[PDB]
Amino acid sequence: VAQGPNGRALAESMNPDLLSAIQQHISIERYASVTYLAMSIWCAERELAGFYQFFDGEAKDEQSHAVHFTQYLIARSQSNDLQTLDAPRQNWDSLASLMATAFQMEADTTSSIQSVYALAERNSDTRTTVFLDPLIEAQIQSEDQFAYLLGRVKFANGDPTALLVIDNELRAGQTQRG
Amino acid sequence: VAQGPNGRALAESMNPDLLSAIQQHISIERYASVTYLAMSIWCAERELAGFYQFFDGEAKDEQSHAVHFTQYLIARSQSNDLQTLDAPRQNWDSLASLMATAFQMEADTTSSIQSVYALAERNSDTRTTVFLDPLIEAQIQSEDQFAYLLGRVKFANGDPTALLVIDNELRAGQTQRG
Amino acid sequence: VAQGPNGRALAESMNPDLLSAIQQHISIERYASVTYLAMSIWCAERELAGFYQFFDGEAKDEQSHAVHFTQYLIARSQSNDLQTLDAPRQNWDSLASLMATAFQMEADTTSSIQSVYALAERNSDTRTTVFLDPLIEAQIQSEDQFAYLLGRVKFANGDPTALLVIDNELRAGQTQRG
Amino acid sequence: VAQGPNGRALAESMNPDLLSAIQQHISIERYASVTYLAMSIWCAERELAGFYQFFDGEAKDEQSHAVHFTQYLIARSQSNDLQTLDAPRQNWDSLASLMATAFQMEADTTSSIQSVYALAERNSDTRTTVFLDPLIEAQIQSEDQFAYLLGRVKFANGDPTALLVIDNELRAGQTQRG
Ligand SMILES: [Fe+3]
Ligand SMILES: [Fe+3]
Ligand SMILES: [Fe+3]
Ligand SMILES: [Fe+3]
Ligand SMILES: [Fe+3]
Ligand SMILES: [Fe+3]
Ligand SMILES: [Fe+3]
Ligand SMILES: [Fe+3]
């Protein structure tokens, strides 16, 4: 039985370019996590408690996604390589602008997964494409959700009264079209 | 015992003009169903989740009404004739405009039932007028309800803040005067 | 952040040929729905109550599948386009013949999904292939189920006694091999 | 306050032709009752226990309908006039033939109600047309039901095996399309 780069018994070798791309995607997820934390803080600074609670949960969720990817590398007997994590963006002129960055961060996370997926297909790594399938499905619902929040905030058109109403929705757990 | 046009034992013959008018009313109900689906989609596209859920339920309800009419024709030993279904309207400039079309569609559904009712009376088909009575009663409450939603949306006068408040009412199941 | 054709924030553009093919598949599902309704009616006309209840449920299910596809287009920020719906077939010489059309309609629905799937693969739209995966899986079980019902009815060889026995199975919810 | 023909306070006079027609309809219902009893007996004589139980219940139901009409005459301060009740038909060559007579008896009961209804309309007796409305509705479901039983028995085509299967359905309470 062969041993993988992390020392465990190796079911099938992984191409180093695919390994590198998974390790980088873990950084993308970790960066989304600290970005949602930064957004949580911005909302708390403006007394938007519902948005603060929503992004606090999202930061924890993105971190769970990152850890889920580190477990896949363990399961494949590959080495992890936790990287330097850049500082998040921390300043926005409005909630609409924040939510725009939020949506783009979700969409960018999906693009990263898609890039890993395409490289797995090139390498015929069916374990990885299967592993990624439910994660792409969750990204579809997250994109749908962030499009909903962004659009609802844009509909408010900067009226504080409407932003308070939406804030209370989020505090209540009303965060999707349903 | 005579057999009806659909092959079952025939309790009493139905005039072909009344049969034709019932078959056409089934199309009216099916068309209202797909119209409310189109309206559900328009609302979902604008993050008006409460209106989206309301019209999603209304599309299912109108379809149930259509099927209820197909069962009456079976019970009368008459043939059904499911027809080509036109494409619904799908574009509106505002929620007020959508709700206006919605109210008119409900009122037009009642007019169709009334036309069937009058033809049954002309033909002295008491089974059909009796069958239609509870359906007219339900139309009265649906007209009352759609007048309520339309008027409440018109009262909002296009203010996004008020439309969000109404949207949340509908998501909560608050869809009538009560 | 870019806006999609339906007005929502756009996570990733969709090729117009793939959009068109999804919109057409929605029509396929809507057409299967009204076809199963027509079959429900044919069975009710011949007092085959179990088959009537089965196809009544199947018509509702196919419609849910159609709506599920309209939600995916919303989630992708694409426009829906609800189309003219052709009239269903409504006449069969026997239950065996009806069930043959029923099986072919299920298989044809899967072919339509497969065609959408292949075009997504050509376009590298991984969101769409992932979205379609559970729906293909459900089609496998539906094909298995309709093959079971068709074959059981064919085994009956037109004996009314056996068709009554099968009818009672379906009324009892015994609709699959299990 | 005026007194009605039966001695009670009279809310509104009834035309004697309408009174006579209601009194005769009570006889129609009583005759259907003893007819279903005769049918119950014929089925019991041939060990068709499910059909025996079904018609035993139907005889009791028709009698309840008759009594319901006698209560309406009391409520209208009109006299009842319970009439000589003819002997029922008691011999049939087959269950198919019995069920044909059964369906015709139900349809004939509805015709009698319709005749009363038309005379009430001529006399503008809105109390009577309102009173009759739910009874016509119940007749629609009874006609639907007897068409179902008749057609299912005809489908059996005189095969004892299929008639036993249907008999067991009826014993189980499976007496309608559902
Ligand atoms: Fe993530
Ligand atoms: Fe996410
Ligand atoms: Fe309706
Ligand atoms: Fe309605
Ligand atoms: Fe389907
Ligand atoms: Fe299906
Ligand atoms: Fe009766
Ligand atoms: Fe009866």
XYZ file of C-alpha atoms and ligand atoms in Angstrom:
720
model
C 0.000 0.000 0.000
C 1.437 3.387 -0.946
C 1.553 6.310 1.483
C 0.244 9.728 0.524
C 2.094 13.003 0.980
C 0.497 13.530 4.424
C 1.579 10.048 5.581
C -1.715 8.167 5.357
C -2.484 5.172 3.156
C -3.128 6.472 -0.357
C -6.221 5.396 -2.270
C -5.295 7.345 -5.414
C -2.639 9.942 -6.180
C -3.711 13.531 -6.752
C -2.157 15.762 -9.404
C -0.121 18.521 -7.672
C -1.911 21.237 -9.637
C -5.256 20.040 -8.261
C -3.803 19.841 -4.750
C -2.505 23.398 -5.047
C -5.885 24.634 -6.301
C -7.753 23.017 -3.391
C -5.304 24.500 -0.901
C -5.877 27.915 -2.459
C -9.645 27.486 -2.364
C -9.382 26.856 1.381
C -7.763 30.305 1.583
C -10.645 31.760 -0.452
C -13.135 30.342 2.053
C -11.097 31.532 5.032
C -10.942 34.980 3.435
C -14.701 35.054 2.888
C -15.072 34.174 6.571
C -13.020 37.125 7.820
C -14.702 39.331 5.202
C -18.150 38.451 6.574
C -16.779 39.137 10.069
C -15.623 42.572 8.907
C -19.095 43.122 7.434
C -20.712 41.960 10.677
C -18.667 44.601 12.517
C -19.573 47.384 10.063
C -23.259 46.587 10.539
C -22.903 46.465 14.334
C -21.200 49.876 14.238
C -24.330 51.299 12.589
C -26.795 49.538 14.935
C -28.009 47.249 12.117
C -28.287 44.332 14.519
C -30.089 41.979 12.131
C -27.397 42.365 9.485
C -24.779 42.018 12.211
C -26.234 38.680 13.343
C -26.615 37.450 9.755
C -23.001 38.139 8.813
C -21.734 36.809 12.135
C -23.376 33.492 11.253
C -22.070 33.669 7.673
C -18.471 34.107 8.900
C -18.834 30.975 11.023
C -20.408 29.116 8.064
C -17.622 30.017 5.628
C -15.069 28.829 8.176
C -16.933 25.507 8.425
C -16.717 25.228 4.632
C -12.965 25.818 4.839
C -12.570 23.111 7.479
C -14.741 20.779 5.396
C -12.175 21.192 2.599
C -9.269 20.469 4.958
C -11.003 17.204 5.877
C -11.245 16.211 2.211
C -7.482 16.621 1.843
C -6.957 14.441 4.925
C -9.334 11.859 3.454
C -7.311 11.893 0.216
C -4.038 11.504 2.167
C -2.866 14.901 0.896
C -1.096 17.598 2.874
C -2.896 20.733 3.917
C -1.067 24.056 3.694
C -2.808 26.774 5.693
C -1.717 30.079 4.213
C -1.230 33.685 5.187
C -4.686 35.276 5.312
C -4.992 38.787 3.880
C -6.793 41.511 5.813
C -10.454 41.929 4.768
C -12.040 45.005 3.308
C -13.467 46.958 6.217
C -14.983 50.202 4.919
C -18.145 50.820 2.902
C -20.100 54.000 2.219
C -23.511 52.301 2.530
C -25.248 49.013 3.250
C -26.104 48.700 -0.462
C -22.386 48.890 -1.235
C -21.568 46.345 1.478
C -24.182 43.926 0.143
C -22.739 44.351 -3.357
C -19.321 43.260 -2.098
C -21.063 40.453 -0.184
C -22.780 39.094 -3.299
C -19.565 39.361 -5.312
C -17.659 37.479 -2.595
C -20.196 34.626 -2.722
C -20.079 34.535 -6.524
C -16.276 34.641 -6.408
C -16.277 31.691 -3.998
C -18.345 29.715 -6.515
C -15.956 30.678 -9.341
C -13.084 29.294 -7.265
C -14.951 26.005 -6.727
C -15.739 25.876 -10.458
C -12.049 26.314 -11.251
C -11.184 23.416 -8.939
C -13.986 21.394 -10.538
C -12.698 21.965 -14.083
C -9.166 20.952 -13.102
C -10.501 17.787 -11.467
C -12.388 16.990 -14.674
C -9.200 17.539 -16.684
C -7.420 15.141 -14.332
C -10.407 12.716 -14.281
C -10.497 13.009 -10.481
C -14.051 11.789 -9.965
C -13.712 11.782 -6.176
C -13.152 15.544 -6.267
C -15.976 16.397 -8.683
C -18.337 14.266 -6.564
C -17.053 15.945 -3.396
C -17.668 19.371 -4.958
C -21.183 18.673 -6.294
C -23.134 19.361 -3.032
C -20.938 22.407 -2.405
C -21.837 23.893 -5.795
C -25.487 23.191 -4.986
C -25.149 25.088 -1.707
C -23.492 27.960 -3.596
C -26.533 28.196 -5.878
C -28.760 28.727 -2.847
C -26.275 31.158 -1.269
C -26.111 33.158 -4.508
C -29.914 33.159 -4.659
C -29.983 34.311 -1.024
C -27.403 37.092 -1.383
C -29.119 38.297 -4.565
C -32.319 38.462 -2.505
C -30.738 40.470 0.333
C -28.852 42.771 -2.043
C -31.941 43.417 -4.164
C -34.171 44.002 -1.152
C -31.650 46.503 0.227
C -31.387 48.201 -3.175
C -35.196 48.380 -3.334
C -35.103 50.278 -0.028
C -33.213 52.960 -2.005
C -31.350 54.217 1.054
C -34.456 55.036 3.081
C -33.501 54.410 6.749
C -37.075 53.393 7.506
C -36.966 50.564 4.969
C -33.465 49.516 6.075
C -34.750 49.190 9.648
C -37.607 46.992 8.423
C -35.169 44.747 6.542
C -32.813 44.698 9.525
C -35.657 43.377 11.691
C -36.434 40.714 9.070
C -32.865 39.442 9.258
C -32.856 39.461 13.056
C -35.987 37.307 12.840
C -34.244 34.763 10.586
C -36.068 35.918 7.429
C -33.022 35.837 5.135
C -34.296 34.150 1.947
C -37.192 34.255 -0.489
C -38.613 31.086 1.067
C -79.796 2.956 -18.832
C -78.336 5.396 -21.352
C -74.601 6.039 -21.649
C -73.195 9.552 -21.641
C -70.717 10.938 -24.150
C -67.763 9.918 -21.931
C -69.061 6.331 -21.660
C -70.507 6.359 -18.146
C -74.128 5.780 -17.166
C -76.024 9.005 -17.841
C -78.254 10.519 -15.174
C -79.417 13.399 -17.387
C -78.294 14.703 -20.766
C -76.475 18.023 -20.926
C -77.064 20.581 -23.671
C -73.927 20.783 -25.878
C -73.754 24.559 -25.489
C -73.531 24.168 -21.705
C -70.918 21.429 -22.087
C -68.853 23.666 -24.358
C -69.111 26.569 -21.902
C -67.939 24.422 -18.971
C -65.019 23.108 -21.008
C -64.060 26.688 -21.835
C -64.347 27.755 -18.206
C -61.854 25.022 -17.306
C -59.466 26.769 -19.715
C -60.175 30.095 -17.982
C -59.203 28.563 -14.636
C -56.103 26.910 -16.083
C -55.135 30.259 -17.604
C -55.596 32.059 -14.289
C -53.326 29.423 -12.749
C -50.438 30.038 -15.149
C -51.091 33.787 -14.886
C -50.672 33.665 -11.097
C -47.509 31.603 -11.654
C -46.192 34.310 -13.983
C -47.057 36.882 -11.307
C -45.334 34.773 -8.649
C -42.187 34.823 -10.804
C -42.329 38.596 -11.377
C -42.553 39.146 -7.623
C -39.698 36.714 -6.938
C -37.561 38.576 -9.492
C -37.999 41.747 -7.420
C -37.367 40.052 -4.043
C -41.025 40.508 -3.007
C -41.035 37.119 -1.315
C -44.415 37.501 0.392
C -46.148 38.296 -2.888
C -44.207 35.465 -4.509
C -45.492 32.960 -1.938
C -49.050 34.309 -2.168
C -49.255 33.980 -5.946
C -47.511 30.609 -5.888
C -50.340 29.361 -3.670
C -52.958 31.076 -5.852
C -51.650 29.310 -8.986
C -52.015 25.960 -7.226
C -55.515 26.944 -6.015
C -56.757 27.953 -9.472
C -55.490 24.645 -10.844
C -57.455 22.820 -8.127
C -60.552 24.745 -9.228
C -59.930 23.624 -12.810
C -59.609 19.991 -11.736
C -62.749 20.352 -9.614
C -64.583 21.302 -12.825
C -63.158 18.305 -14.701
C -64.568 16.082 -11.948
C -68.032 17.594 -12.393
C -67.968 16.674 -16.083
C -66.967 13.113 -15.163
C -69.799 13.015 -12.623
C -72.228 14.157 -15.340
C -70.896 11.498 -17.754
C -69.687 14.236 -20.116
C -66.405 14.351 -21.995
C -63.647 16.681 -20.937
C -61.662 18.504 -23.615
C -58.431 19.956 -22.249
C -57.444 22.779 -24.564
C -54.387 24.620 -25.770
C -53.357 27.004 -22.987
C -52.233 30.478 -24.055
C -49.050 31.994 -22.652
C -49.674 34.293 -19.653
C -48.878 37.957 -19.422
C -45.425 38.210 -17.898
C -44.396 41.874 -17.738
C -45.631 44.693 -15.507
C -44.178 48.120 -14.764
C -45.098 48.013 -11.055
C -46.675 45.890 -8.344
C -49.755 48.151 -8.423
C -50.146 47.325 -12.114
C -49.655 43.605 -11.459
C -52.283 43.636 -8.709
C -54.678 45.431 -11.066
C -54.324 42.616 -13.598
C -54.674 40.145 -10.708
C -57.980 41.633 -9.545
C -59.288 41.776 -13.112
C -58.348 38.118 -13.647
C -60.320 37.104 -10.536
C -63.306 39.207 -11.601
C -63.063 37.772 -15.117
C -63.082 34.248 -13.670
C -66.327 35.079 -11.855
C -67.839 36.508 -15.063
C -67.053 33.215 -16.796
C -68.774 31.246 -14.011
C -71.751 33.624 -14.209
C -71.999 32.999 -17.949
C -72.041 29.242 -17.342
C -74.625 29.783 -14.598
C -76.965 31.768 -16.865
C -76.773 29.127 -19.595
C -77.557 26.407 -17.053
C -80.580 28.418 -15.913
C -81.707 28.772 -19.535
C -81.379 25.002 -19.902
C -82.952 24.364 -16.449
C -79.838 22.396 -15.467
C -80.298 22.569 -11.706
C -77.373 20.229 -11.039
C -75.036 22.774 -12.632
C -76.420 25.866 -10.882
C -76.197 23.997 -7.557
C -72.657 22.872 -8.395
C -71.695 26.479 -9.187
C -73.250 28.090 -6.087
C -70.342 27.426 -3.633
C -67.869 28.417 -6.353
C -69.557 31.800 -6.812
C -69.464 32.211 -3.031
C -65.721 31.538 -3.028
C -65.312 34.072 -5.850
C -66.990 36.726 -3.693
C -64.367 36.189 -1.000
C -61.546 36.074 -3.570
C -62.766 39.336 -5.117
C -62.970 40.868 -1.640
C -59.435 39.607 -0.959
C -57.883 40.835 -4.215
C -59.609 44.205 -3.787
C -57.989 44.341 -0.341
C -54.487 43.531 -1.632
C -54.811 45.852 -4.633
C -56.106 48.725 -2.504
C -53.462 48.238 0.172
C -50.750 48.277 -2.502
C -52.286 51.378 -4.099
C -52.382 53.046 -0.667
C -48.623 52.450 -0.430
C -48.397 54.811 -3.438
C -45.196 53.227 -4.722
C -43.183 53.815 -1.556
C -40.731 50.867 -1.317
C -40.876 51.052 2.468
C -44.630 50.454 2.503
C -44.365 47.727 -0.156
C -41.847 45.901 2.046
C -44.256 46.119 4.986
C -47.079 44.675 2.873
C -44.756 42.008 1.478
C -43.992 40.878 5.037
C -47.726 40.784 5.823
C -48.308 38.404 2.927
C -45.368 36.203 3.894
C -46.977 35.970 7.336
C -50.294 34.791 5.853
C -52.034 38.152 6.401
C -53.785 38.273 3.015
C -57.346 39.399 3.842
C -59.223 41.993 5.861
C -60.073 39.348 8.463
C -22.042 43.904 -9.701
C -23.702 43.046 -13.009
C -27.460 42.576 -13.351
C -28.923 39.517 -15.028
C -31.580 39.545 -17.729
C -34.367 39.252 -15.115
C -32.992 42.234 -13.153
C -31.326 40.459 -10.236
C -27.640 40.526 -9.331
C -25.847 38.118 -11.662
C -23.478 35.503 -10.274
C -22.509 34.156 -13.708
C -23.868 34.718 -17.203
C -25.751 31.903 -18.902
C -25.383 31.093 -22.594
C -28.659 31.978 -24.395
C -28.872 28.521 -25.956
C -28.845 26.943 -22.489
C -31.430 29.454 -21.266
C -33.674 28.635 -24.219
C -33.310 24.895 -23.588
C -34.255 25.246 -19.906
C -37.275 27.358 -20.808
C -38.347 24.670 -23.266
C -37.848 21.921 -20.701
C -40.230 23.781 -18.386
C -42.797 23.449 -21.189
C -42.037 19.716 -21.423
C -42.766 19.331 -17.707
C -45.923 21.435 -17.920
C -47.044 19.296 -20.858
C -46.403 16.077 -18.944
C -48.524 17.534 -16.142
C -51.570 18.165 -18.333
C -50.967 14.809 -20.042
C -51.140 12.993 -16.693
C -54.296 14.999 -15.928
C -55.806 13.817 -19.216
C -54.817 10.260 -18.267
C -56.330 10.708 -14.804
C -59.608 11.698 -16.483
C -59.569 8.734 -18.891
C -59.114 6.368 -15.953
C -61.877 8.070 -13.952
C -64.205 7.717 -16.953
C -63.690 3.941 -16.800
C -64.075 3.688 -12.997
C -60.368 2.835 -12.570
C -60.190 4.904 -9.402
C -56.715 3.771 -8.342
C -55.209 4.772 -11.678
C -57.201 7.999 -11.519
C -55.711 8.885 -8.123
C -52.199 7.899 -9.230
C -52.230 10.095 -12.328
C -53.908 12.944 -10.464
C -50.922 12.949 -8.106
C -48.479 12.617 -11.017
C -49.954 15.701 -12.739
C -49.418 17.709 -9.556
C -45.866 16.309 -9.234
C -44.866 17.207 -12.798
C -46.160 20.732 -12.227
C -43.994 20.968 -9.093
C -41.008 19.917 -11.211
C -41.837 22.683 -13.687
C -42.026 25.270 -10.907
C -38.764 23.941 -9.465
C -37.155 24.775 -12.825
C -38.645 28.284 -12.835
C -37.024 28.836 -9.432
C -33.622 27.816 -10.801
C -33.906 30.473 -13.508
C -34.784 33.064 -10.853
C -31.794 31.914 -8.799
C -29.564 32.343 -11.869
C -31.001 35.833 -12.519
C -32.406 34.644 -15.857
C -35.804 35.437 -17.323
C -38.528 32.844 -17.413
C -40.712 32.589 -20.512
C -43.874 30.590 -19.863
C -45.055 29.306 -23.218
C -48.215 28.275 -24.990
C -49.107 24.794 -23.733
C -50.356 22.316 -26.335
C -53.469 20.243 -25.690
C -52.694 16.755 -24.310
C -53.537 13.464 -25.912
C -56.890 12.416 -24.506
C -57.970 9.155 -26.153
C -56.644 5.617 -25.737
C -58.106 2.260 -26.736
C -56.948 0.494 -23.547
C -55.165 0.984 -20.243
C -52.135 -0.873 -21.650
C -51.968 1.711 -24.434
C -52.351 4.581 -21.961
C -49.553 3.211 -19.778
C -47.345 2.895 -22.866
C -47.812 6.596 -23.600
C -47.235 7.275 -19.888
C -43.887 5.460 -19.849
C -42.812 7.161 -23.075
C -43.721 10.572 -21.628
C -41.537 9.909 -18.565
C -38.662 8.685 -20.734
C -39.105 11.695 -23.020
C -38.932 14.005 -19.996
C -35.592 12.427 -19.061
C -34.315 12.841 -22.641
C -35.152 16.544 -22.418
C -33.223 16.867 -19.137
C -30.306 14.966 -20.700
C -30.287 17.399 -23.619
C -30.141 20.335 -21.201
C -27.397 18.527 -19.278
C -25.241 18.000 -22.381
C -25.562 21.655 -23.384
C -24.569 22.731 -19.873
C -21.515 20.473 -20.101
C -20.628 22.016 -23.469
C -20.913 25.449 -21.860
C -19.112 24.283 -18.666
C -22.123 25.431 -16.628
C -21.426 23.389 -13.507
C -24.261 25.020 -11.565
C -26.739 23.589 -14.072
C -25.299 20.061 -14.216
C -25.277 19.990 -10.395
C -28.844 21.323 -10.322
C -29.917 18.594 -12.764
C -28.195 15.665 -11.009
C -30.928 14.947 -8.376
C -33.586 15.424 -11.059
C -31.990 12.766 -13.272
C -31.849 10.500 -10.219
C -35.571 11.014 -9.637
C -36.204 10.245 -13.320
C -34.437 6.895 -12.911
C -36.873 5.952 -10.154
C -39.851 7.301 -12.127
C -38.788 5.289 -15.184
C -38.390 2.214 -12.979
C -41.851 2.897 -11.529
C -43.630 3.455 -14.853
C -41.938 0.361 -16.297
C -43.337 -1.525 -13.296
C -46.899 -0.235 -13.774
C -46.808 -0.716 -17.550
C -45.430 -4.248 -17.252
C -47.889 -5.226 -14.534
C -50.767 -3.955 -16.682
C -49.390 -5.798 -19.720
C -49.103 -8.969 -17.615
C -52.829 -8.639 -16.870
C -53.287 -9.162 -20.637
C -56.536 -7.201 -20.737
C -58.353 -9.343 -18.181
C -60.732 -6.963 -16.329
C -60.349 -9.032 -13.174
C -56.590 -8.469 -13.082
C -56.978 -4.777 -13.976
C -59.318 -4.357 -10.998
C -56.730 -5.988 -8.731
C -54.023 -3.626 -10.001
C -56.383 -0.660 -9.706
C -56.898 -1.496 -6.023
C -53.121 -1.748 -5.538
C -52.684 1.779 -6.866
C -55.518 3.139 -4.734
C -53.688 1.629 -1.756
C -50.453 3.453 -2.649
C -48.739 0.306 -3.987
C -47.211 1.943 -7.074
C -43.625 0.615 -7.159
C -41.668 -2.610 -6.851
C -40.607 -1.629 -3.330
C -100.406 35.556 13.105
C -101.959 33.086 10.672
C -101.971 29.335 11.293
C -100.785 26.893 8.658
C -102.659 23.804 7.514
C -100.854 21.639 10.109
C -101.799 24.039 12.934
C -98.495 25.832 13.481
C -97.815 29.542 13.049
C -97.421 30.206 9.328
C -94.438 32.155 8.028
C -95.597 32.045 4.396
C -98.341 30.145 2.595
C -97.371 27.356 0.221
C -99.129 26.743 -3.088
C -101.098 23.452 -2.862
C -99.485 22.132 -6.039
C -96.038 22.528 -4.464
C -97.260 20.901 -1.249
C -98.636 17.959 -3.218
C -95.365 17.585 -5.138
C -93.287 17.543 -1.937
C -95.597 14.963 -0.385
C -95.184 12.813 -3.488
C -91.411 13.201 -3.431
C -91.423 11.848 0.128
C -93.085 8.742 -1.337
C -90.365 8.564 -4.008
C -87.696 8.566 -1.296
C -89.559 5.999 0.798
C -89.877 3.827 -2.308
C -86.162 4.105 -3.057
C -85.540 3.011 0.533
C -87.559 -0.202 0.249
C -86.086 -0.753 -3.226
C -82.543 -0.628 -1.821
C -83.699 -3.009 0.928
C -84.987 -5.406 -1.733
C -81.626 -5.077 -3.501
C -79.785 -5.684 -0.227
C -81.754 -8.928 0.154
C -81.055 -10.074 -3.421
C -77.334 -9.562 -2.845
C -77.444 -11.380 0.505
C -79.208 -14.305 -1.192
C -76.215 -14.644 -3.530
C -73.575 -14.268 -0.779
C -72.504 -10.848 -2.125
C -72.022 -9.540 1.397
C -70.336 -6.272 0.416
C -73.199 -5.314 -1.884
C -75.631 -6.438 0.805
C -74.049 -4.104 3.371
C -73.876 -1.224 0.881
C -77.554 -1.405 -0.047
C -78.583 -1.958 3.565
C -76.943 1.378 4.377
C -78.479 3.011 1.289
C -81.999 1.951 2.354
C -81.446 3.588 5.740
C -80.033 6.714 4.032
C -82.984 7.118 1.658
C -85.348 6.812 4.615
C -83.415 9.585 6.388
C -83.868 11.738 3.279
C -87.609 11.059 3.399
C -87.786 12.055 7.063
C -85.713 15.156 6.309
C -88.459 16.169 3.858
C -91.196 15.550 6.440
C -89.350 17.934 8.768
C -89.326 20.647 6.099
C -93.112 20.413 5.817
C -93.400 20.728 9.604
C -91.078 23.741 9.491
C -93.304 25.312 6.815
C -96.438 24.605 8.900
C -97.748 22.295 6.165
C -99.434 18.938 6.619
C -97.626 15.738 5.817
C -99.523 12.951 4.065
C -97.706 9.626 4.300
C -98.946 7.504 1.427
C -99.432 3.891 0.475
C -96.004 2.515 -0.442
C -95.850 0.215 -3.468
C -93.977 -3.081 -3.295
C -90.399 -2.850 -4.640
C -88.962 -4.739 -7.552
C -87.387 -7.869 -6.126
C -86.013 -9.987 -8.979
C -82.998 -9.445 -11.229
C -81.146 -11.811 -13.549
C -77.693 -10.442 -12.641
C -75.857 -7.939 -10.472
C -75.235 -5.779 -13.563
C -78.998 -5.617 -14.086
C -79.596 -4.806 -10.414
C -77.031 -1.999 -10.507
C -78.702 -0.622 -13.642
C -82.013 -0.376 -11.789
C -80.104 1.109 -8.835
C -78.567 3.885 -10.939
C -81.907 4.615 -12.601
C -83.603 4.834 -9.190
C -81.030 7.404 -8.021
C -81.389 9.401 -11.239
C -85.177 9.185 -10.950
C -84.972 10.513 -7.386
C -83.035 13.525 -8.687
C -85.616 14.080 -11.452
C -88.324 14.176 -8.783
C -86.370 16.774 -6.777
C -85.820 18.785 -9.974
C -89.561 18.743 -10.642
C -90.225 20.060 -7.132
C -87.496 22.661 -7.667
C -89.019 23.937 -10.923
C -92.463 24.254 -9.341
C -90.971 26.183 -6.421
C -89.279 28.523 -8.899
C -92.599 29.009 -10.703
C -94.182 29.860 -7.353
C -91.156 31.978 -6.275
C -90.829 29.808 -3.158
C -87.228 30.661 -2.326
C -87.324 28.748 0.960
C -87.954 25.538 -0.982
C -85.305 26.071 -3.673
C -82.778 26.880 -0.923
C -83.885 23.809 1.037
C -83.431 21.653 -2.078
C -79.997 22.991 -3.100
C -77.854 20.784 -0.765
C -80.057 17.800 -1.623
C -79.403 18.246 -5.349
C -75.697 18.506 -4.531
C -75.858 15.207 -2.646
C -77.681 13.655 -5.617
C -74.797 14.656 -7.895
C -72.390 12.706 -5.697
C -74.812 9.768 -5.407
C -75.217 9.675 -9.195
C -71.432 9.817 -9.569
C -71.150 6.988 -7.026
C -73.796 4.724 -8.575
C -72.309 5.322 -12.032
C -68.986 4.194 -10.547
C -70.417 1.002 -9.018
C -72.492 0.184 -12.104
C -69.555 0.751 -14.454
C -67.149 -1.237 -12.299
C -69.619 -4.135 -12.215
C -70.129 -3.886 -15.984
C -66.341 -3.894 -16.455
C -66.256 -7.203 -14.562
C -68.315 -8.552 -17.498
C -69.999 -11.214 -15.380
C -66.785 -12.891 -14.248
C -67.492 -14.221 -10.714
C -63.860 -13.663 -9.777
C -64.082 -9.943 -10.525
C -67.486 -9.658 -8.820
C -65.970 -11.159 -5.662
C -63.160 -8.593 -5.789
C -65.674 -5.749 -6.118
C -67.833 -7.254 -3.375
C -64.833 -7.159 -1.026
C -64.179 -3.524 -1.986
C -67.706 -2.583 -0.953
C -67.473 -4.518 2.307
C -64.325 -2.496 3.009
C -66.164 0.807 2.465
C -64.566 1.437 -0.952
C -67.751 2.613 -2.691
C -66.654 5.701 -4.664
C -63.923 6.891 -6.999
C -62.349 8.864 -4.150
Fe -18.062 29.035 1.400
Fe -21.270 31.245 1.320
Fe -60.651 29.875 -9.883
Fe -59.380 32.728 -7.555
Fe -41.039 15.823 -14.372
Fe -42.208 12.163 -13.728
Fe -82.798 10.109 -1.513
Fe -79.642 8.298 -2.903
